[PDB]
Amino acid sequence: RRDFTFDLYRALASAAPSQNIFFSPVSISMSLAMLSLGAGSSTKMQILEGLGLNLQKSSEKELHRGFQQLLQELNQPRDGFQLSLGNALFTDLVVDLQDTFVSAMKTLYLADTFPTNFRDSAGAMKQINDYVAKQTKGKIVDLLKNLDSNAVVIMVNYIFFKAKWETSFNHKGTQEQDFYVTSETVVRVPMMSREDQYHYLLDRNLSCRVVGVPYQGNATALFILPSEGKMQQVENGLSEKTLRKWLKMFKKRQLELYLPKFSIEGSYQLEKVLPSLGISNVFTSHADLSGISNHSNIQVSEMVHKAVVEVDESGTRAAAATGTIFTFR
């Protein structure tokens, strides 16, 4: 009975007041659901709860079957559209993981497993960052910064997305135009444009306008423009229910759309924000991660997340990665 995606969104915004935010819920939630796989006691429960698991309607396994389905429904780089999701386990040379954990990871999550010498911190980082970089076509370069020495295993998740718009924007239709960060801080940005039929929507409650711009394939970009002075209001009103409401509320309309060509990114240490969603234990020495290993002790040192997006007249490019680091002491 909680909106993890939007609860996390607000947490990240509150922590960075008037700065850009960007992340991949699927990446983080899938990572969390994987983590719960080798979690026990209350720690295994804060995660499921934090995800908004029904414990009845949805039963743990349904959660995994879902992500499993998602991973399976993935298609090869079609034409002008590509979405890939992967999971990887990097295990120290001298540690054993429980058969169940490893098995579930390979079966439900199609996870790769790479032996890693964590005694050589520099080498471990290179191996892992190179993999994440490789999987995100060079969009996420340095996921880990100072890999602890007690690092004995790192669980990684990545997401890559590239797609051309269903209908591009006329490259020559872009002009330098004013952008108001605040009514007083204004900066020039290349403003894209295109008059056409779009799925419009006017939410008078949250107080904002929503446009749906489809991609060549299955993925639509939703751009929310909160009315003057209401960004905070709509941010608070964001919810899974709202998104559903917005989705069928959508009716096509003749629109002369002006969108700025942009690029943003976010880096977050999730171990710092998740306890705001009730996910705290697993990140402490009080953690119960007995499902992952028997030489217990281990906890989650940090959970780094990184996401980037590029938006131009051709389409969009987006990727992100989540690195769950398990240490010994």
């Binding site: 008037s18 993925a219 929310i224 909160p226």
Partner: peptide, 29 residues
């Protein structure tokens, strides 16, 4: 008619599949 819609102030962004793939706020291009 032809309604005008210009994103010249902070704005949210969703990249939706059947699930929410990406979410963020563009506070400043």
């Amino acid at each position: 008619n032809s309604q005008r819609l210009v994103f010249n102030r902070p704005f949210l962004m969703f990249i939706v599949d059947n699930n929410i793939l990406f979410l963020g706020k563009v506070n400043r291009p």
